[PDB]
């Protein structure tokens, strides 16, 4: 939904999306080759599926080519200063890729506005959408936009023949929050099932070694183990085929 969206959001209204109760296979998109860069910050590109965060945040905005390099932890640059201010301890992976084949259009794509000028940089992840026309000089503008008075936003107009420094690179940056139980985790493999062999099993929670034989014990619809009169494991419900 977020990556393959048809309607991306402009950068002056840069987006955010809390995602919970998810199984997030980061690698099925890491091995996509449709990206310009998977520049993880805080963690590695792989070795995410073994992580369990509370929520992840999917920003969905588009920038130019060099503004990708602008996007990085604790940077100094127009977008990192007036549109999307990463904190320096940002835990995630910026995932940007050109869309000059997709979002560009003849004559230009004038639907994108970047925060042209404003008095000061933002807080981390501060979503500034206020369109208060720039105040400067010595007087408020009152809409006329006189000298030193300007609009805080500037249209892009993506021309399909613009260089890599001006081509649309739809960017989507993810963040990791840990507070509470973790509802988002990468998937877990599940091997084949071997019976009648002393194996070192590991069912979803519990471990141990034994010889798994097809039984006839009839658990209740919700149970997961069994136990013996001395509280030793005696049966396990196969979590793929019950």
């Amino acid at each position: 939904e977020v990556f393959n969206a048809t309607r991306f959001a402009s950068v002056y209204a840069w987006n955010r999306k809390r995602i919970s109760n998810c199984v997030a296979d980061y690698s099925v998109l890491y091995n996509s080759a449709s990206f310009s860069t998977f520049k993880c910050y805080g963690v590695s590109p792989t070795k995410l599926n073994d992580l369990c965060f509370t929520n992840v945040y999917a920003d969905s905005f588009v920038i130019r080519g060099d503004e990708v390099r602008q996007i990085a932890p604790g940077q100094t640059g127009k977008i990192a200063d007036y549109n999307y201010k990463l904190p320096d301890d940002f835990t995630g992976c910026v995932i940007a890729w050109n869309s000059n084949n997709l979002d560009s259009k003849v004559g230009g794509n004038y639907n994108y506005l970047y925060r042209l000028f404003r008095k000061s940089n933002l807080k981390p992840f501060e979503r500034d959408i206020s369109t208060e026309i720039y105040q400067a000089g010595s007087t408020p503008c009152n809409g006329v936009e006189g000298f030193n008075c300007y609009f805080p936003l500037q249209s892009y107009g993506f021309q399909p023949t613009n260089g890599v420094g001006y081509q649309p690179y739809r960017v989507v940056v993810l963040s990791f929050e840990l507070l509470a139980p973790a509802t988002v985790c990468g998937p877990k493999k599940s091997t084949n099932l071997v019976k009648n062999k002393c194996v070192n099993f590991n069912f979803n929670g519990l471990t141990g070694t034994g010889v798994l034989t097809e039984s006839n014990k009839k658990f209740l619809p919700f149970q997961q183990f069994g136990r013996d009169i001395a509280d030793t494991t005696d049966a396990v419900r196969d979590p793929q085929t019950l």
Partner: antibody, heavy 116, light 111 residues
Framework: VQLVESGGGLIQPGGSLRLSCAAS????????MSWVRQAPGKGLEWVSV???????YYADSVKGRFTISRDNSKNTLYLQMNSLRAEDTAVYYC????????????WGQGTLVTVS | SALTQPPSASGSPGQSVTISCTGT?????????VSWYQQHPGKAPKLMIY???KRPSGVPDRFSGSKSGNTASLTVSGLQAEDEADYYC???????????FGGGTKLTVLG
């Protein structure tokens, strides 16, 4: 837009000049500004910028040594330098503007600065 | 890399003269914005044509040359006795906010 620079001179390696461009006509706070210089008989040489969020940039020969600053209000505007060599003689001029977008249209009066 | 040009381009008074502005496609064929410059000897660096389809507020009309892909060119029409000066160029690099300029086009109008 009455901007009047002040502070040029001639400096041996080690000194530091602090220019002072008055910002009477145009706020430098909650605004932007750029510093430039021109070698006699040459196109311009961008030497410094100051964004609204205090961001700063310098060109090759001046990054790491050139240090621009200014007071909180629209009083003044500086350009400090360090480790001067014989290569840096060029007439100075102030350039109202910031980067390519929002071009340089308004300018200063020009202070003759010579480094050798 | 820099907007290097032939520093001397001449022509007859009243007719037109082309003042070029040449750099690499990393910038000149990338952005929407290129700005032109000119200086009468001693005058402050005066921009000529920013946002090539645009000019400043009251600056006269016989300016506004264009950008022919990888190479720009200023087309001054109606050369009058006040059209003798030095010309320059200006635009932005593709790195670290770097703003570029021209090598210095001394517009030598025949006297």
């Amino acid at each position: 837009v009455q901007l009047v620079e002040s502070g040029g001179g001639l400096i041996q390696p080690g000194g530091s000049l602090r220019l002072s461009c008055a910002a009477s006509g145009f706020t430098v706070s909650s605004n932007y500004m750029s510093w430039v210089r021109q070698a006699p008989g040459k196109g311009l040489e961008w030497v410094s910028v100051i964004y609204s969020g205090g961001s700063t940039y310098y060109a090759d020969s001046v990054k790491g040594r050139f240090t621009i600053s200014r007071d909180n209000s629209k009083n003044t505007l500086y350009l400090q330098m360090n480790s001067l060599r014989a290569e840096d003689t060029a007439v100075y001029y102030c350039a109202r503007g910031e980067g390519w977008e929002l071009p340089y249209d308004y300018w200063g009066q020009g202070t003759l600065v010579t480094v050798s | 890399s820099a907007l290097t040009q032939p520093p001397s381009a001449s022509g007859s008074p009243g007719q037109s003269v082309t003042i070029s502005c040449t750099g690499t496609s990393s910038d000149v064929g990338g952005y929407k914005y290129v700005s032109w410059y000119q200086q009468h000897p001693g005058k402050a660096p005066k921009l000529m044509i920013y946002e090539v389809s645009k000019r400043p507020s009251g600056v006269p009309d016989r300016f506004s040359g264009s950008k022919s892909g990888n190479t720009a060119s200023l087309t001054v029409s109606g050369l009058q006795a006040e059209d003798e000066a030095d010309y320059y160029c200006s635009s932005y690099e593709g790195s670290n906010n770097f703003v570029v300029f021209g090598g210095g086009t001394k517009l030598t109008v025949l006297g």
